Nucleic acid binder design. Structure first.
Lengths: 184, 146, 260, 146, 254, 49
RNA sequence: CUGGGCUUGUGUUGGGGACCCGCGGCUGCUCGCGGGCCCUGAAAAGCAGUGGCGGGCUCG
């Protein structure tokens, strides 16, 4: 027996989603960012239950379906459109290189040929694709910590890291380093 | 109605012994190195009955399971005589939780802060419409039977 | 636009309102709280621009200030409220130890935005606030927030909408409150109170307050001329291409036209 | 077996038709539902009329949801007897109520280029209307010409 | 009863009282320091400092394994970050006193052998790679041996650090460690055959080469200058391979 | 319509608490003689255990 | 135009009234759009009206 309050909370919380999405589409698909390019790590955040179709397909585009997983992404003009659309269900900010270091070493898993198997060996990274300058684990970090000409290909090999659930614990400048630190 | 009552009343919970001592240590420290009247939830049977009799209460909540029931039998009718809206509530344990005791037979609100005078008057209207109107022609009738 | 015929209308409409007010009312009743001079005064006449296009095809809901050579609301009974986007106690201390003597008198109540949403969310309270003051200011950091806070009771009518006031420097509240130097604040408050106000609505008629019916007409004529020239050059698009009739009319009388 | 019409008012903002249909469909079978809106701006008048399949489920839903403090609104759900039930009471049930932007419509309805023959009618309606205003300010002692 | 009282203010409802009881709990998930004081237990368990080095055979090798391990519910990431801190503290002692002599590698990983006060200590470090914990294993048991070897190595490296006289604990920088310095994030101020091997040598590590074991071995034998790639780490010798100061560059490429 | 008691209301209902004031000064003497540590804000508690 | 401002940033509960207007239409009364002056517990008892793109449900 769903109570009436839950119904009213839904509609007020869907109209605010409609209002904000109109404001994004009104101004432009742009964000007030300096011209220097950076990299953003995005983490799924538990949020609004019912997802509108346009934030839903952007989670699908960012392979963000299941909760709490996370992917890497650079900045384009197009990325800031996806950033501020899916923002109430994600947390974003520029990570640090050592934060990537745990994410490929301790948190690293593998995706090749459409089936998800764990990382097995460095030669398995060669076996996966291993071709576009891919010789070890630091290939992914080189495409991540530095902006990569084949980082889109590096993301194509990449799978959303299923991050760990913490126990009791706007762009973050470097405060996202604290995000994985409780979520590693 | 019980849930909406405790939404307002939990905002007016009395201070615990831990945080009362902390505030006393705060003010004593500042003297070594400005406030208004505190609005809390009024409790205590002898205190609340006096607040009823001086018309100082605005809403009254009465536990339905006081095991000498003589302590609360006159209390709905006394609130009716002076005009104060009352509501019989489930749980003498629930009211004691609200007021940091094991038990509480009666709970009264007297005056609330200015940020929530509207939702108290809305809660009072929800008692004289949702509770005291249905009780009206069934509070004078004998219970049970067979 | 011509000034002399504007003046001779301004004589005629203003002289009419004295004849209308001084005429007795036929059910044999008087008014305790309405002197003949007090109702000859306190009755504003206002300029009604008529356009061709619907100007600013949206609801602007934020007034624009036209600096008037001689101010509008500088009487002795004006209660004014300053809605501020920062700790209320900093502005409360600012208006108490400073803000001359006239501004100290007119400051009725300064209220934080956070304290406004807690104490004035209901529609009793935003109606009690409407009837208690006369002019409402607002910091420019909360001009957008006031439609939700002070709703239809403050924004259905254009008589009392919050006036945009800049009160910034060029965040933890107790540590820092980014404000101007205090003399630059009180000087700017003076400008905002006595300024004629434009209100852009998807409409053809715009009513701009020009003064009350106890001023002397040449004072009014200099004031309406500045309202005319400021509004066309700055606010209405297609400056003189979209211009149309310009009436002046009191709250209980007919419309006196000027054409452009 | 006749349908029963229930009048619900003091509707919170958010408790519109699809949420109104969804909640009361958990009680029984909802046949026709229509909230009372405004043709000028699409906006509820905080008042809706519903009609169920069975009269038993109409009395059950109204009696259990009569005074229910929902988002600051103590509701009022009453049963309209079949003696009254106005025949044209569900003229727009189970239909979207679109928000027609008349002010944007009429604002640029003025702006479109117009016929030259109509522009003659524009002048005639103008000169009739200016002439009568010249009459109605001549007892005010005013003459203006254009 | 303390976890019974943390169900107290949670049950009746008191967020402030639930907090002040749980700061008083001092739970290991936010501290890294252990829940219970193991001072008197190790007082009765191990009799002499030589047996601490004998127990250092087991104490080090799991913590090098645990520091590479990811986090579970039983072992918080702050416990691993304290494991990675404490595993680095024993490494910084070894590279100062040059006590590392023998090293072996196998399928299990990397074995190091070091003599401290005439006592040989052997520990196994697997490679920098996430290990499958597939099967029936107990993390609750495993989290205790973390707490065991946290306090023991913390006690062992405290005794030896005053023995060498350098001030303890060593000072650490947060964000410069967050840039990926790993071993080189920390400053050591000496007052509060091994050396002759690569006494004056210049080293560079490339992109494939294992950064952590190579730097640990080189600094243990007194290699003054070790550089590596900007993506392997930072706060090192100049990354550019065109700089002719480098004598030997470590490369494992086909 | 009117309250039952016509007794006057004491002035202690309109002024700050006497008993709280006497308890404050007892803590002041403890801080003066150093028996009780002074108040530490939660920010200082964040720089603690 | 270095120093003071400017310009975008669209976000309003609903009813009623024994009142003054401006602009649109129609053979027309009158009805729309926008103001002004009052009343109102976040109050409430048909009077729902304007043409369309797409998609869905259907008939061949």
């Amino acid at each position: 027996f769903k109570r009436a309050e839950k119904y009213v909370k839904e509609y007020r919380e869907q109209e605010r989603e409609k209002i904000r999405l109109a404001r994004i589409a009104k101004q432009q698909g742009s964000f007030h960012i300096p011209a220097e390019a950076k990299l953003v790590f995005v983490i799924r955040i538990k949020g609004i239950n019912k997802i509108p179709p346009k934030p839903r397909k952007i989670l699908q585009l960012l392979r963000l379906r299941q909760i709490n997983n996370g992917v890497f992404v650079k900045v384009t003009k197009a990325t800031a459109e996806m950033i501020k659309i899916v923002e109430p269900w994600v947390a974003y900010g520029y990570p640090n290189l050592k934060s990537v270091r745990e994410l490929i070493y301790k948190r690293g898993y593998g995706k090749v040929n459409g089936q998800r198997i764990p990382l097995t060996d460095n030669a398995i990274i060669e076996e996966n694709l291993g071709k576009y300058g891919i010789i070890c684990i630091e290939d992914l970090i080189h495409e991540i910590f530095t902006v990569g000409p084949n980082f889109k290909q590096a993301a194509n090999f990449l799978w959303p890291f299923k991050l760990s659930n913490p126990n009791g614990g706007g762009n973050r400048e470097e405060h996202i380093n604290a995000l994985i630190r409780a979520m590693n | 109605l019980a849930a909406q009552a405790f939404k307002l009343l939990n905002k007016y919970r009395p201070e615990t012994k831990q945080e009362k001592k902390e505030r006393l240590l705060r003010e004593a420290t500042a003297i070594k190195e400005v406030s208004k009247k505190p609005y809390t939830v009024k409790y205590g049977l002898n205190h609340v009955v006096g607040l009823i009799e001086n018309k100082k209460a605005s809403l009254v909540l009465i536990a339905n399971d006081v095991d000498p029931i003589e302590l609360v039998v006159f209390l709905p009718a006394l609130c009716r005589k002076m005009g104060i809206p009352y509501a019989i509530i489930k749980g003498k344990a629930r009211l004691g939780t609200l007021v940091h005791k094991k038990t509480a037979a009666v709970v009264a609100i007297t005056e609330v802060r200015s940020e929530d005078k509207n939702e108290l008057a809305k809660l009072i209207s929800a008692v004289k419409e949702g509770y005291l109107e249905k009780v009206e022609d069934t509070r004078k009738r004998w219970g049970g039977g067979i | 636009v011509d000034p002399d015929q504007t003046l001779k209308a301004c004589k005629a409409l203003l002289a009419h309102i004295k004849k209308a007010a001084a005429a007795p009312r036929p059910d044999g009743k008087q008014n305790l709280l309405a002197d003949e001079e007090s109702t000859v005064a306190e009755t504003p006449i206002w300029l009604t621009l008529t356009t061709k296009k619907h100007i600013h095809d949206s609801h602007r809901l934020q007034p624009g200030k036209i600096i008037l050579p001689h101010p509008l609301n500088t009487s002795e009974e004006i209660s004014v409220c300053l809605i501020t986007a920062d700790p209320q106690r900093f502005y409360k201390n600012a208006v108490a130890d400073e803000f001359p003597e006239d501004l100290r008198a007119k400051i009725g109540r300064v209220i934080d935005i956070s304290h406004l949403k807690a104490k004035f969310k209901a529609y009793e309270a935003q109606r009690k606030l409407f009837s208690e003051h006369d002019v409402f200011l607002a910091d420019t950091r909360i001009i957008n927030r006031l439609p939700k806070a002070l709703g239809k009771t403050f924004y259905k009518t254009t008589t009392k909408r919050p006036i945009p006031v800049v009160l910034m420097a060029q965040r933890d509240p107790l540590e820092n409150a980014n404000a101007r130097p205090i003399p630059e604040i009180v000087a700017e408050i003076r400008k905002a109170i006595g300024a004629a106000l434009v209100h852009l609505s998807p409409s053809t008629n715009t009513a701009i307050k020009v003064g009350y019916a106890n001023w002397e007409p040449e004072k009014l004529a200099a004031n309406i001329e500045t309202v005319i020239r400021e509004l066309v050059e700055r606010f209405v698009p297609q400056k003189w291409q979209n211009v149309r009739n310009f009436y002046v009319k009191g709250p209980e009388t007919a419309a006196l036209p000027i054409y452009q | 077996s006749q349908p029963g019409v229930m009048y619900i008012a003091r509707l919170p903002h958010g408790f519109y038709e699809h949420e109104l249909r969804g909640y009361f469909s958990q009680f029984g079978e909802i046949t026709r539902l229509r909230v009372v809106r405004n043709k000028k701006t699409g906006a509820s008048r905080h008042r809706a009329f519903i009609e169920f399949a069975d009269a038993e489920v109409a009395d059950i839903a109204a009696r259990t949801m009569d005074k229910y403090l929902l988002f600051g609104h103590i509701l009022t759900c009453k049963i309209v007897p079949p003696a009254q039930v106005h025949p044209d009471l569900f003229k727009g049930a189970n239909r979207r109520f679109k928000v027609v932007p008349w002010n944007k419509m009429a604002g640029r309805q003025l702006e479109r280029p117009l016929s030259e023959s109509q522009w003659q009618v524009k002048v005639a309606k103008e000169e009739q209307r200016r002439a009568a205003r010249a009459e109605k300010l001549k007892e005010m002692g005013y003459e203006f010409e254009a | 009863a303390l976890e019974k009282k943390i169900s107290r203010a949670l049950g009746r409802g008191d967020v402030s009282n639930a907090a002040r009881l749980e700061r008083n709990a001092n739970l290991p998930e936010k501290t890294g320091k252990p829940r219970y004081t193991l001072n008197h237990i190790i007082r009765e368990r191990y009799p002499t400092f030589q047996d601490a080095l004998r127990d250092l055979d087991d104490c080090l090798s799991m913590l090098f394994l645990f520091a590479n391990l990811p986090s579970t519910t039983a072992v918080p990431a702050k416990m691993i970050a304290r494991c990675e801190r404490l595993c680095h503290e024993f490494q910084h002692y070894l590279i100062v006193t040059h006590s590392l002599r023998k090293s072996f590698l196998s399928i299990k990983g990397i074995y190091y052998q070091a003599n401290i006060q005439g006592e040989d200590i052997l520990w196994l470090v697997p490679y920098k790679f996430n290990q499958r914990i597939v099967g029936d294993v107990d993390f609750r048991i495993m989290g205790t041996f973390v707490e065991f070897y946290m306090t023991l190595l913390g006690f062992v490296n405290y005794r030896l650090y005053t023995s060498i006289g350098l001030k303890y604990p060593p000072k650490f920088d947060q964000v410069k460690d967050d840039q990926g310095a790993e071993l080189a994030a920390f400053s050591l101020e000496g007052l509060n055959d091994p050396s002759q091997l690569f006494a004056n040598f210049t080293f560079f590590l490339s992109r494939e080469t294992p950064r952590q074991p190579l730097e640990f071995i080189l600094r243990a034998f007194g290699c003054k200058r070790i550089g590596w790639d900007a993506v392997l780490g930072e706060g090192a010798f100049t990354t550019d391979e065109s700089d002719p100061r480098i004598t030997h560059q470590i490369i494992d490429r086909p | 319509k009117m309250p039952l008691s016509a007794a006057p209301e004491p002035k202690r209902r309109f002024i700050p608490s006497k008993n709280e004031a006497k308890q404050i000064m007892k803590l002041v003497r403890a801080i003066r003689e150093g028996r009780i540590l002074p108040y530490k804000p939660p920010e200082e508690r964040e720089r603690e255990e």
